Amino acid sequence: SGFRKMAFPSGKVEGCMVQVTCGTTTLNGLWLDDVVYCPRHVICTSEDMLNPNYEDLLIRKSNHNFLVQAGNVQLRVIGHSMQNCVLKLKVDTANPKTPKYKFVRIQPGQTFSVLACYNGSPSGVYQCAMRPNFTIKGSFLNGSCGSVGFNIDYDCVSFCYMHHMELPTGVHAGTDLEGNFYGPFVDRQTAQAAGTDTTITVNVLAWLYAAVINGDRWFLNRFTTTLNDFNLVAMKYNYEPLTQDHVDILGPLSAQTGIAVLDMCASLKELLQNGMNGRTILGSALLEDEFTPFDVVRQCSGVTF
Amino acid sequence: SGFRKMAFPSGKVEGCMVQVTCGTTTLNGLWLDDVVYCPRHVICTSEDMLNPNYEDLLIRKSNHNFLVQAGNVQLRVIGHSMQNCVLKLKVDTANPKTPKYKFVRIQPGQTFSVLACYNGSPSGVYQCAMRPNFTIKGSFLNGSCGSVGFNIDYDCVSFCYMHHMELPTGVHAGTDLEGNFYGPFVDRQTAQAAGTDTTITVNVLAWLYAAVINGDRWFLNRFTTTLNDFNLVAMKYNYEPLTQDHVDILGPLSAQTGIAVLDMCASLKELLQNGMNGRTILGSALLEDEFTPFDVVRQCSGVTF
Ligand SMILES: O=C(Cc1ccccc1)Nc1cncc2ccccc12
Ligand SMILES: O=C(Cc1ccccc1)Nc1cncc2ccccc12
Numbered sequence A, B: 001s002g003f004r005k006m007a008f009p010s011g012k013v014e015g016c017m018v019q020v021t022c023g024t025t026t027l028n029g030l031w032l033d034d035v036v037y038c039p040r041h042v043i044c045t046s047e048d049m050l051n052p053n054y055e056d057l058l059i060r061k062s063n064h065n066f067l068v069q070a071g072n073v074q075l076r077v078i079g080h081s082m083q084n085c086v087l088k089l090k091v092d093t094a095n096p097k098t099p100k101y102k103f104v105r106i107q108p109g110q111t112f113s114v115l116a117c118y119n120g121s122p123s124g125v126y127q128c129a130m131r132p133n134f135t136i137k138g139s140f141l142n143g144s145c146g147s148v149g150f151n152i153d154y155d156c157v158s159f160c161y162m163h164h165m166e167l168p169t170g171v172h173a174g175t176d177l178e179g180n181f182y183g184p185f186v187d188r189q190t191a192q193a194a195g196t197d198t199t200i201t202v203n204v205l206a207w208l209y210a211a212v213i214n215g216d217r218w219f220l221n222r223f224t225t226t227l228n229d230f231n232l233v234a235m236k237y238n239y240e241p242l243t244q245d246h247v248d249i250l251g252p253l254s255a256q257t258g259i260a261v262l263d264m265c266a267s268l269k270e271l272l273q274n275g276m277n278g279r280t281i282l283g284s285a286l287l288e289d290e291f292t293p294f295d296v297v298r299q300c301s302g303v304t305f
């Protein structure tokens, strides 16, 4: 019993965190094999950030301009190249702690663990979701740039996020490990704002199934709904559309609890139209959308790494 | 910016998790130096659990009755002793991944990270608080016994909890790493129930200061309160008494935000009376009590917004 916001064990990623210093700017790098990946804005001054020409700023740098520190050991940079918004620093030493890994680009609604780091040192781990507006509601301070997002599938770390910036609302923007930003964001000190966010419907449904598995049934009702009528109500409350794929992915949870996906959609409809009426679901007065159907199954079955 | 429930990076603890088997029973052990610590109920059958005589069950065991597995390597048990509710298995190999560590016994209201494990393999990490009734609201399934709670302030792991059991309400009970249970619990299948739980007042106040640091002030008011009048009101909502120690502990956050502790107590009184009126505080519709004053100072910026 119990249901917590749970992150993956961060050990395989902790062994990859390094400090990258260029001039006055220090941030985090991910050391995998003989390459250190970090945000390309590490080469920028506060004036450069206003309107950066990264190719021009980078061509003026030599390998010895980048100081890379892995614990209390300096790594020598033997090459440097840019791939989208990520700087790749070739180092002489392959990381002996390099886990089995892949670079994966995630979709909004998918969740991942973030190992927040400062000066190449991990400080904390938390779970979060890529919002439908492509931001993440993270917890980051200055120096956290280069901190990464990941999932674990068996013994393989799938790196899906690298932190680059904080937007004026306090939400965060970053890239996949190939340097492609999630969302319509650019790595430049300029006016940028997150779009109006929506609730990840399939995730709320997954969390309602987790509540049922943990003995919270007060919100269940005798009603069902069509997928189309549910989506009309979802559009009205700034909830993402629920697709037939979402209904299919919720199949296992539906079979385990005996509550059909469209039967659970009628509970969600009622919760959106009427509220919680002073009650909680899994200790929450809000509908939680940062657990995917897979996260729910994984936590309510004890999958290990 | 941002405020998340954040766990410590679990890597230093992952390198200590082993599987302990005694007969048909399998659970987790913590391998530090040449000793494996695990719940002593590993020697019990499901039957034995009503009234186990651990000294009698243990005297019938030899070292070779305990199978300890670290990854795909069997460790040889060369000694065994019981210390309170923890079994200590002396092994022939010191753990090369043993971090700098200490065993610390915590007080209710203190937070810690839990590395949930099954079969000696870490499955997830989450943040917990020791409830005032000495239970933890964890997320544990069968086989999670031996999973540990810890804090990592600097490079030192302070082990504060070892999971032993799930109480009938779905909350969890366990011991410090010296085998002393937190709360009036015993490792017996006898009728045991958690006492009525209360809200950790000092933690809610710390979280209100975190909200002020992150720019939210909607809940503040022009009022102050005496410590005694606050306690008379707060006990009516099942809130723990706030002591002068708690007021002292909140001093640094009070100085940083410019809001006196008893002025913040008046905001809390009003929040308990009014509810949130459709508003949130740090993305939460409930008052959060699983962040200590120390957690808030560690996660929040030293500059208020
Ligand atoms: O936004 C940037 C840098 C940047 C990157 C791209 C364009 C402009 C600026 N860094 C930060 C990321 N997270 C949290 C922060 C908290 C305080 C200050 C800075 C933070
Ligand atoms: O309580 C025990 C065993 C035990 C230990 C001590 C006395 C009686 C019984 N084990 C478990 C610990 N955690 C979560 C659980 C979730 C589901 C089932 C069992 C769980």
Ligand SMILES: [Cl-]
Residues within 6 Å of the ligand: A052, A053, A054, A055
């Ligand atoms: Cl450019």
Ligand SMILES: [Cl-]
Residues within 6 Å of the ligand: B017, B018, B019, B069, B070, B071, B072, B119, B120, B121
């Ligand atoms: Cl193992």
